[model samples]
Target: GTRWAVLIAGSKGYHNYRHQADVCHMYQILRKGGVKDENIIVFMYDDIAYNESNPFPGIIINKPGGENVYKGVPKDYTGEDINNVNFLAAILGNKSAIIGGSGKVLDTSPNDHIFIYYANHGAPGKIGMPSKPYLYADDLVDTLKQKAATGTYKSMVFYVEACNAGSMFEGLLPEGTNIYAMAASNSTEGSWITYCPGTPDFPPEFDVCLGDLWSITFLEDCDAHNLRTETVHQQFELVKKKIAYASTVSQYGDIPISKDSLSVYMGTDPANDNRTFVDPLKVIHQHDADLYHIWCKYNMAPEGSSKKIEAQKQLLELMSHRAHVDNSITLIGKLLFGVNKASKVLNTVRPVGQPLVDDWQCLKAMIRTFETHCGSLSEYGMKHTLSFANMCNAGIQKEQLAEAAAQACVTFPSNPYSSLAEGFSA
Candidate 1:
């Protein structure tokens, strides 16, 4: 069977360095395994490499002091091209669904195997796409079903890395679909970043972490063995064990096909075998992009420069946004269920077999309504996805949440104490 791969890094900027680095690393694995560039489709925001904070211009590395994985990556889809519609179009082989991009859709046949890898921020049911109309579980499964209906490919193995990654496919993807999914974390958990600067495990000069824990773990496994001899399930098991300290890895979709050799999707090469694997150090906390972006900017800025002062102010702005976003959700919980019961309502976790939400459409509207009144659900705000799920699960309508959000979050005037200055707001 012919091998086809789709790689995406749904993040932009230097603070999200690990996301693009992970995708670039995955790209190198498939490329080194002999997958042709023509057979690969990539969607990245394409901002990290030449960004101002990049210590080494035009190079990206997954591991500390490692070789550049950014080399030879095709600029197939970049910048504003990294959106949900373009991604679904690429997956479905429906060129007309795409707007502006390289126009390279996944033109695979039923005899071919597909490997998909996406890395970035994720909420309960939302996959960050760096574009409006964020990618949701509903549309993704619909597109997958549509693709399956077309009989365009034999089997597809999807590997996604993000906080609450399992929420994407927990109860959505049905069995017998011949699509296998590996999520970096369980539904109620956060995926962590590793190899951070100044950490005992990693001591580097960079401002941001080198790579995400699950991403580095699996990519290291790929580096350690040849795809021909390793089964997909075997690689999953090994990667699962290696990332034990961080987050729980979850699998969805067809189970039997996981026993197939990794080469079925990633191809193989004799020269790539017998490499050594380095165990990743445990960094439990997930990286908060909104805050970290400013902090890194401030940290890397010249001490006495006005840039440092602005970055410092931006840090506090996002920090307060985190505080405000949380307070609004808590206030909503309080207004609907009372301050005492609010804790239980917002903090409750579903059973292991259940997904984040039962109604996909309601959940999206719920999120949108909240964001409409409040603001964009920044990466830090994504933690409150459980709160949104709880309200939706409680059978609350969008209007009710909208009223609650409206009462809780209000637009601030251009005053000193009222809120941060207007120019500093996100």
Candidate 2:
């Protein structure tokens, strides 16, 4: 019997491009399901800026203050965020996996059963690069054509979280190949990447992202059915309904979709209740705002060009004015100024709670802070932010949790295919 294998990749740093921490968490769950340790592989690449060349490939990646404890990357290669231990586990596992945006491809043979998973910000049929206007697509058809010509594998599993990716497997996969593939959204659909407070410090084992709502739920459903593998449509349906529900309730609804055909099957009879709910729009609003700021900090002016800008003085002047307006905002101003006016939150000399000020008074302080430091919100920005405020004013809303009891999906460690979605991969 061909053992199950996986390729999981995650990108970090860029606000919208970063994969949620939950991607790592899912690996443990899948591994616990009795999949052989040698059969799985995972890769993590940190683009931070969504740039043209990630630290992966031949370029050496370094996180600066930290060490790459896992040694996942080759000593000869360079990339950013290359040392995620979860990623290392996959590359060193019984099967083979690669990490970083380096040019490494999946290594599988015709006799091997393979499953590939990717979680990151994606455009239609493309994974965003750290640089502007670059993309990475699986080229499954072309790759599979060669495999078909040479009979590489008896089955294939490909899962992705990018726009218009559902059709990736249609003509690319070899005929008679047991291929199961899913895209996060339809060709016309859009999806989002999320950021919450403390995301950077989140443990590799926790679920702190909305994308996991889809993948984790599928695993849960797999456990519920007590089956090693389930239909691709079944897993897609479960993930789609959960994502759709989140889109309506949160600002994260950039575009959440599954294959249209699966859309019908799942939509017609969506079942099993495991979604999430919230009352405030600020959760998503803040998510987007912080993401925008973070992206600007890392991508634009990356070479210390921010200091030479003519607007710097004006920004400083505004900061001074806002500080004098109130004590609380003044305190934040002091903190920033005291720290050499380092504006990046990552550079904050002291801890700051960006999300703590959601109340009216705190919001007042936050508004003042934004004016003083980040700049005033545009009319459109104001509208969206206020929309979330209004929603918060309404009351608590209900949704579904993304993950259920692990036992709900599966209990056996021998059966690595733990959910409908994962099983479909087999």
Candidate 3:
């Protein structure tokens, strides 16, 4: 009974390929979730033809001619992809649309629920035009405003997998409407290529969430628990976390690009309530160790505070999770530190040894032991029997734990943890 329209665009020669693939995969998920195919509308820009099905989930394809021109009638989208109108009909519950090209997005119609996705290459609001440059932010925001004006759709979700996409939410987020925008990078960053490799020529820019490296796992996860009953937001999140975790492995523990790095409205105020919430600490356990270390440094080591302690707990949990994953240790370390970043400084800070004392070696050994027994990410706690330590007492890199980790990894198993440390290049 849900209704929405999707615009998944790919780059020229094959820009929309990734988006199309994602749409196809997502459609299967939707179907599984009891959503009637008729309730959704899909648009694949630069697509030669819309694939046909026995029952038909109602889809449209728009493939411009060699000259990059639309072949449909003046107003409504006909020859290009009848599914566009089908989608519109499903969403509006009536045949009302003015589809021609991306430009037609200018026409704002009032509606209850609106869903827009740009899976193509972009600069800001404009779709990427190999012939020209990327689109501007102002123009894109205008179209977004138009859709927001429609009173019918309160839940407004827009997924834009493009470079510098964060700018799409610069302005125009309809009040009371949940708007979710997932971009490939921050406004100051460029998109990424898939792990599939090559000259990065064919698949111009693929959304990692829709690619093989991440998609296979996604499908498996969705199938494992029958997540079809969840809402769009929940469904999207189900895939989001999977993609985020896979990205760490594919990119060597460094998050290359994020879908939610930039956003405005989380989702439709009410309908957006769907969420796949997990303890951040839990996520860290399954996460790589080098990554766990970085998490400790960035998230836990900064300063001492309630927030930091909470982060420490999550990190420790991650470490403990790893311990469970590894056959080495059983009981993970207990966490008893004050919440926040400062706790790390308190727990890790120690006296600096002699110049030739091989402090690094000692530190590495200690770190290796801690990780080896403390589990993976969150096994360590502020409540330690160790001698109290402080930054003032130890140099930034002189801490025994830090030095021990640096040294210990020298002989650490060459698994994801080590690979991440080496690939921690990011």
Candidate 4:
């Protein structure tokens, strides 16, 4: 069967450097594993490597002193082009629906095999896209169903790295759909970043983390072992073991097909065998890894100095962002219910389980309304997805939910949430 791959990095900027680097590394693996360049579709913000904030320009590497992964990478959909609508269009092979891209869409047949890998921030039922809109769970499954109905491929595999990524496939994709999915974390957990503290290969205090933990674990396994010998399940087990410190990784979709050799989805040309694998320098905590990184930088700096002060400032900003995420959700709840009723909802100490949003129309409409009024969900605001889901579960109408968001936007019309609207609108 002919092999095809789609790799996406759904975040932008220097702090999100790991996301794009993850995609580039996956692209290299697919190419080296034997998939042809034309058979692969790549989507990324195309920032990070060349951003003014990047200490290393025009090059992206996943490990300390690793070879540049960005070299020869094709720019299929870049910047604003890497959005939710275009992503679904690409997966469904809808060429005419694309906007601001290289006009690349999936062109495969029933005898082909497909592999999709996505890396980004995520919340229950939605994954971050490089822009305001997000890739919702229902729409994603709908697209997969459309592709399956077309009988264009024998089997498909998805390896996703994100927080709550399992929510995208859980209870949505059918078990008999001939598709397999492995998520970096379960429905209510966060994926981690790794390779912190710069090594001999890179400059000090320069965003030491090069790749995501779960992502690079599998990539490194493919890098070390012979792709022809390893099975998909084996790689999953390895990744699951190494990434135990973070959220539990979960798998969904057809089970039997997962027994196939890793090469089936990852590709295995003769040239890729016996390649050297460079391991990451170390592992950082999975949840809130970025904040941990900033904290590390602060402590590593000379005490009471300008550099330390700058690191302290960044840390404050990160903490403030976390608070804003909570506040935005609380404000929405307050608007939906009265302040007294909302306080009980917000103050719940336990983690509320998020249900899979089956109503795509309702979810999409609510998502867009939230973006327009409250700001893009891709930022720290994505954590509020649970709040939206809660409202949906509470039997609140979509229009009511949207109206409440608008009212909440007015109530807290300044600080962090307001800044999100300004940043995206500009």
Supply candidate 2's per-residue lDDT for 368. 32
In candidate 1, what are the lDDT values of residues 1-426, reduced to their tens digit? 688999999877688889999999998888888899988999888888998878789999898868899999987899888887789989988898888988888999989999999999887777777655667777888898888878878888999998889888878888877899999998878888887776655534577888889999888777777677788888778888878777888899997889888888887666766642222584746646546556766887889999999988877776677777778788989999997999999898888667788877777778778876777655677677688789889988899998888889777323222332211111
* Regions of candidate 3 where Cα sits further than 4 Å from its true position: 45-114, 129-136, 171-175, 195-224, 228-426
Against the reference, the lDDT scores of all candidates come to: 0.80, 0.35, 0.35, 0.75
Clashes of 4: 1
- Could you give the candidate ranking by lDDT, starting with the highest? 1, 4, 2, 3
Total clashes, candidate 1?
0
Greater-lDDT candidate between 1 and 4 = 1
The TM-scores of all predictions, comma-separated, are 0.92, 0.43, 0.38, 0.84
Cα lDDT of model 2 by residue, 10-36, tens digit: 344433323423334334444434444
As for candidate 1, its clashing pairs are none
- Give the alpha carbon lDDT tens digit for every residue of 249-343 in model 4: 78888978889998888866465566522223355544466586677668878888997899898777767656755666677788888878986
User: Poorest 10 consecutive residues of model 4 by lDDT?
Assistant: 346-355
Off by over 4 Å in 1: 200-204, 273-284, 287-289, 300-302, 412-426
Model 2 is weakest, by summed lDDT over 10 consecutive residues, at: 396-405
